[PDB]
Write a protein that binds this ligand. Structure first.
Ligand SMILES: [Ca+2]
Ligand SMILES: [Ca+2]
Ligand SMILES: [Ca+2]
Ligand SMILES: [Ca+2]
Lengths: 306, 300, 313, 307
């Protein structure tokens, strides 16, 4: 009935873990184990750690097979495909363009943007899988891969795997915006998952991840300048889709989809969500108010009651 | 709330789907969509169809990248990875060795073994396409030991695309489930009288008490060890695996069955797998559960 | 156990379908199906859209057979019959007359009372001017007066509700309570084996009726709107008198084999008035409930056939 | 609680009315009213009575509109439409082809198998020859062929059952199970507050329950397994498929009785195409060799009893 909560820092954000029925000691051990695992995940994906596995790939100039871990190969493989399923809205090679703008301290880019698009593109990345090893291969020397739009999802899922190892079957795990829910909370009820305005959903056995455009676009005046850049135009998105929440089997998928959908905007997002049978929640600032939209698949998660 | 159940046949076996109460009309639609997908999956990897994706590849003598669906690449990728973590016990290239046994041979079987080997396959994943690639023309891939596992995971995702997030789906010896029952209770999945809650996971089982045999210490088995070309001979009667996906469960499943009690337990501990085994000692059987597996057990 | 209620707007009014518990996706697919069908009926009948099948016929001047759909033929067919059974009270061709008082919907209340040009207008009116022709693969409407104007607004809600129900059946749902405007249709029991709730206007325990296998429709409300000049002033116009009804009838509810029929009967019964209405009710042995305002009080009245539909639970 | 059961003869078959809480006096009066009404319907549609309304029309040679009742109008209209929707399988003008074989129940036949002369006979049949005209106080039937012969027996039973339903309403009776031949309409609860029991018998050679509260049902078959006496109005000869029984549930007994005969004629495959498209609730029984196989549509399933 008692719910122990563990929290800490990771990947420039925060992680949480709610585990029912744990003693002070095992709680201690688990925090140690959790922090250590996320630390290693940070060391894997972090773009700020010039020494991370990812940055080491980014720094190299090789065009031949580059050994990486199974996780890394899986993270990239799913990132590429969902990138392709979002007409390219979800691009893990868009870093150069985001840097040109100085988003996520600048001078609007003249026409360096066109020339910068040439050093971006999903089709430049390849994942090779073999029995005893996996590899990332780029056909562009200065291709730059950033995975901060999916790292939180991956971390949340990996965190689920840690619970299994530690023989824990009931838990509320989250890293930043991504969460995985399983089992009943303190009381014999599903963990409460509040989506942004606090409508609640029950994702027991599923994962969730939110994503949006907040740059003075979320309840603000002086309406101007979006920091989400469409990897197709090389420029700021213009539509009014401010928030996208996705529920899926894994938090990694949830995390890959929401970014891409966010980028595409309302119209296109809906076309993709319908075609893929995804459970999505959308907030758009049309009038001075915020209107919502929920695909059918997303409603079945709503907590019908109180 | 009610509880609807849909079933049929596919891949030379049976498929089932348990969904919270639904109406007859929607049942017929979901049933048709399910059967069509499973049919699609079978047309993809069945070795009995001369025109399945897998067979066209098997028939190709090309050593250059052969394009395949995302599913194909993913099934292969897991097979090769779990194939290594099990000392090659779980081999998807063993086909030419199993064939020369008529089960499911002179020491000349080393000939078929030559055209065998997990290191002969590579999977290439790109944004808009995937490819399989073999460095041996003769290489022959077979995914029967893993098909049900995938099919089951794929069915659960179809249910997901259909707005059904609460379910218990199964294909052959594999099951997949996420969500509670009509009541906020776990879908009852009984082990070979213990039950487990596999919410968010998959589960596969190999062999049964009705698939173990007599005549001396000789354990009669159809299961052929890839690193031998000959039938296994240990005392592992059955093995059940709970994993993140039924596809992985199905993979570890046959891998562990090939290895046997002792060797398998080694992997189970190393890989931290959720496993349940039954072995034959005297005239009785013993049960062994990894700690990880014990955590999924559900009483009341 | 639990009921799924879908809702929307159509024909300038509200529609509602109370169905037994359904998923989310399935529920979205249904509403989708329903709205489409309802939009299609609106485009079929609406006198408000100049592109509708009805308005096109009205705009035509030919006297030969004009091809229409099964629904059109059927709707006109039972409006002519119920029309004659009410002695012209239910007249789908009374349009030219109404347009003379600037009454009805919202013809911008500025049309003073007419003179006796209503006389020269009723000559553009007449149930005898319409014929319906049914064949195996096609149907037709036929008028013998070029300027005949057919208005199906008093019977449209009833047809929509019945068509909505036949759509529920096509979708495998045989238990439901469906409504469009003031017309309701139902058949099959609740999730609890009980009758779907259908309340009746309580002038001052409210009456409840089980309309299983039938359709129902009401005209008016005890929330009247007449008192100033001449006891009762209405916007409804007697098709045979060319003038606004002046009687005591506050509202009439009719239960019939279909919402369509029920919608035709109550309009015509509302026009006729209390006594004339009762004669036709007795003669056709209809299931009717009436509310009349006597003197600072409302009185209720039920035909024997109507009492038979009452649920005494 | 006590259910009174009334029965009698009509249209060469039998009708039954099960009604709860009714007393001796009322039942006696109802039995009179029912039989009186049925008689009139029989007098309206029978082709076995040379005096009936339908026969007067059949015997005439008129090409101009022929005045009939609303019921006659609606019956024909519904039959003509469902006739078209079943690809002419349900044909109310096929009577002369049937007689050619002498497969009319009241026919020997011991005739002589007709030769392809059946073609010169189909020419005297067809749903496109009939027209229904409705007006304020009148309705007409019009045929563009003298010798056209209309027969409404494959559908008169559904109309009688639905007509019986209206009768029940007139008398203030809300709970009943009323039937005429193989067509029934169910409404309300039985002796115990339970849905009237309606079963679908198996054998159709030579048993499930459904709750059709607020709906109607009719069954059609080809009882008598090798040579069928069901004539395909489009070929002029006996059907060849193995469908032997079709049960249809619909909002009205007329519709149900109209469809089941059409589907029966079409066969399993073509019938299922129709069931699917029209979203009909149907149950079919096919006999391969000596093995009976069944098939229900989704809409039918929802009427299956579950508890
Ligand atoms: Ca993201
Ligand atoms: Ca397996
Ligand atoms: Ca009306
Ligand atoms: Ca029939």
């Amino acid at each position: 009935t008692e719910v122990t909560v563990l929290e800490g820092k990771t990947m420039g954000t925060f992680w949480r873990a709610s585990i029912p029925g744990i003693d002070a000691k095992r709680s201690a051990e688990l925090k140690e184990k959790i922090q250590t695992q996320l630390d290693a995940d940070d060391q894997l994906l972090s773009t700020y750690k010039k020494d991370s596995a990812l940055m080491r790939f980014n720094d190299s100039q090789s065009l031949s097979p580059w050994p990486v871990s199974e996780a890394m190969a899986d993270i990239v493989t799913t990132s590429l495909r969902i990138g392709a399923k979002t007409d390219g809205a979800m691009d893990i090679t868009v870093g150069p363009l985001v840097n040109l703008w100085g988003f996520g301290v600048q001078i609007p880019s003249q026409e360096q943007i066109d020339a910068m698009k040439a050093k971006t593109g999903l089709q430049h990345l390849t994942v090779i899988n073999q029995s005893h090893q996996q590899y990332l291969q780029k056909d562009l020397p200065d291709l730059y891969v950033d995975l901060s739009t999916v790292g939180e999802g991956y971390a949340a899922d990996h965190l689920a795997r840690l619970m299994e190892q530690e023989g824990i079957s009931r838990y509320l795990v989250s890293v930043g915006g991504a969460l995985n829910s399983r089992g009943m909370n303190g009381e014999g009820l599903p963990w409460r998952v509040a989506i942004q305005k606090q409508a609640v959903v029950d994702i027991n056995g599923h994962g969730i991840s939110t994503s949006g455009s907040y740059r003075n676009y979320y309840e603000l005046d002086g309406k101007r300048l979006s920091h989400v850049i469409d990897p197709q135009t090389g420029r700021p998105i213009e539509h009014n889709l401010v928030s996208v929440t996705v529920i899926a089997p894994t938090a990694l998928e949830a995390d890959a989809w929401d970014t891409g959908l966010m980028v595409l905007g309302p119209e296109k997002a809906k076309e993709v969500v319908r075609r893929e049978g995804l459970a999505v929640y959308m907030i758009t600032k049309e009038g001075d108010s915020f209107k919502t939209w929920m695909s059918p698949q997303f409603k079945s998660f709503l907590v019908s009651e109180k």
